[PDB]
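Blackboard transcription, Thursday session:
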Amino acid sequence: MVEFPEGFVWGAATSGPQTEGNFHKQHQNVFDYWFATEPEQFDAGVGPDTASNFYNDYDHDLALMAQAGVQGLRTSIQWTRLIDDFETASLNADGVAFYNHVIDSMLAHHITPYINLHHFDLPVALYDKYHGWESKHVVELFVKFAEQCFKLFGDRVDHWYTFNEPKVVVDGQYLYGWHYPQVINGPKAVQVAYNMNLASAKTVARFHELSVRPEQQIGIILNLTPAYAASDDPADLAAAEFAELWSNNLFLDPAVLGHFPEKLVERLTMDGVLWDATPTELAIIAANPVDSLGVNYYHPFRVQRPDISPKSLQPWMPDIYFKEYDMPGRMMNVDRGWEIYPQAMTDIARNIQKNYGNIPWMISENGMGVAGEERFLDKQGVVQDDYRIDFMKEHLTALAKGIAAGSNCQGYFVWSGIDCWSWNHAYHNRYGLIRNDIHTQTKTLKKSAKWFAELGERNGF
Amino acid sequence: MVEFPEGFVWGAATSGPQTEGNFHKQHQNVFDYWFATEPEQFDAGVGPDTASNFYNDYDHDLALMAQAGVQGLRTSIQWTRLIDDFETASLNADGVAFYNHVIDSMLAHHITPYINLHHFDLPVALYDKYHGWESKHVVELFVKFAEQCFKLFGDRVDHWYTFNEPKVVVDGQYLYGWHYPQVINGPKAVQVAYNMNLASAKTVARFHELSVRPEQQIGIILNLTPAYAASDDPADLAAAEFAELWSNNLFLDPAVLGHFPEKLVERLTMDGVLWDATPTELAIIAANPVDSLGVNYYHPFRVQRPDISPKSLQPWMPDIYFKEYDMPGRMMNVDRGWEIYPQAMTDIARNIQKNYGNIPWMISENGMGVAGEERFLDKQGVVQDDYRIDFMKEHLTALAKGIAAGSNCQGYFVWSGIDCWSWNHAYHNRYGLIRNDIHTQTKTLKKSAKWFAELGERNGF
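(Written on the board underneath:)
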């Protein structure tokens, strides 16, 4: 009844930091270092050191995911595992061998690889030495790392992504304390958002210098949730318009249209917090847009006016212009604190189709996190996650409406394949099609896995 | 009788490596290492370690150049003196203090500073670690170096040069054995010529990122001597055609026009030796042409067909397309092996005028070196170098005719002010207006010096 285009990709999304574990990894990223020194900041004291044991059990993990109808797996290559010397991007041989093993195994199981280069995992040594993403030198080191990935694996990987949601890096490392180093500095955050936008452009440039097949393409993964104003009142609208420019246009516009949003640049210039740019850097951004777009969506985004005037003496933050708003009568994922609003996927699809040239895009992430899933085991040891199937049904329904209106969506990737380590939340919330009992790292298909495999076979539901 | 436009600069030219000595210099450049290691390759075993003692005697040295009518002085800052760590361009405080002292002493003596950034003096450690100018990483490290010079001295230096004749670095380091490392390898030479053009464009961009006054301008110093064919047999003008593209257009076209000469790139392509270039690098070159041109001219350049076919089985060199030619009846500087042909300066002036938008340019070097000037000491120990005064009048006569056709020549710099250290030839040939007795480091003005001072006070002769 709900059907999908011929050739639609049914996939799963994870990342290296949340699956592999730190086995034999040469370098600490910022989350590795944070757990090593502040294990109390992580749920039940569970860090990334073992995660879901993908380093050791990748071949059987891929077999399980293949059973669950995963036609494409998007994951990430860790900068801190592939590279020995960050300055020259020399290679760690065992890191190279591991990713060769993973990729060949995907292929042996008929899973198309989607390879993203960075998922929140900056080497902590680059933060100590250069302050990380604030440094344009670090931006160059990143490009060197990307070059190695393309040279080593571009023979059998077609689909690439530069970053998974750079905004979460900006937000987490420099605004709200989610990511080590937990800097709280608005103006620095502005410069970091610029630098990652520039690092992405330079990575598309290097990618196409080395591309040999016409199938090879590289994208970026962004969150494009609309900023819904609380009311039609003018102050709520003004808060919405800025929240939109800041949370969406800051990255979508450079990546797809090749320039930063004029109104946002004007605003940050007025507040004296604009980034430092050179003409050459702006020319690189303008000359190397992405080939495709990955959209991550989980919950809506609503915004009302700020409590106090933005002109009050206070540290600059993007939040001086908008405040989060809770809508009465919202439909809630109560244990999780997330509103359920599948219509936003249709809003997203329409925007891409209308204002961004209907660039090729996919749902790179959509999923539901539930705690204590052992409450839903049946008498055969399988999690009856009907709530997860329902969640997928409602959101896929909204997505198909966007497609029927003509949006260029080409796939849907579940977060996630196998339950994986969710940063400070660790394993408190489960998202997978496949459960992981993490004391023994024993993995077992959930009920939704069989439904997902069957969805891919009928290409609908 | 022969007068010049108002404001014409009468100056002198040298370099850091050829004047300073290595007193308390932190790093070895390629020539320092070559001398410390093969002193037998240098005339009379005289190296750059003391040179003309400019490190110790800059103040009185400058007072004497001013007496000789040096209105502006061009010289160079040594990468190997100013920089502590090359990777970051951190500063050597004593080097910074030295160059501040030199620049401030120039202005106290009313000499305008013309500061060039590079004169054959690659740090030898950058060769050992990266192969020097073959590495685009080294190209970035030079821009870091150039940025520090701009920030440290741009407050009282208006006129800058990226390089003094990069073709001599290509030729000497990678084709004919003139410069340590003495590599003989055509393909590498092609890539080094391209990399250095790229460093200069990147330096021009950085300079205008930081320039605050409109007087501040940055140029490049090239040799633009025309390639005169031996005859008008088609084989000789084919040789003169390539010799022109290779020796002049290879650097002048990128520097001034923003692009490499297409028929050169076509032949480098057909022969399988083209440099590796990215679109971003080419756009940088197109977008940052130099502000002005420095021309070095000493002697003409004559070319005939090669002895064998360019299709013979031999390693690729540019010389497979042309062989130098000795014209019967040439006017010669016999003691030196150099033809005298002042008309060439008139040809250069016209070329720049007609084919390069008449860009502001100057003669950055012109001079005559003779050996054993002890033979022309008068009773008060003054060199009576009438041969030097004559040489200047003939070339100035030719330059003045070029200006009268309207060519935008704005100054004339003689090589050199004080006798300086001429690489492997050391002090065998002297070019200065001021003699240096190198055993005692005592400088006395030659007769040409007082003649130069009258020429500036009058703008003619």
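Lecturer's comment: Chain B touches chain A through ten residues (CB under 8 Å).
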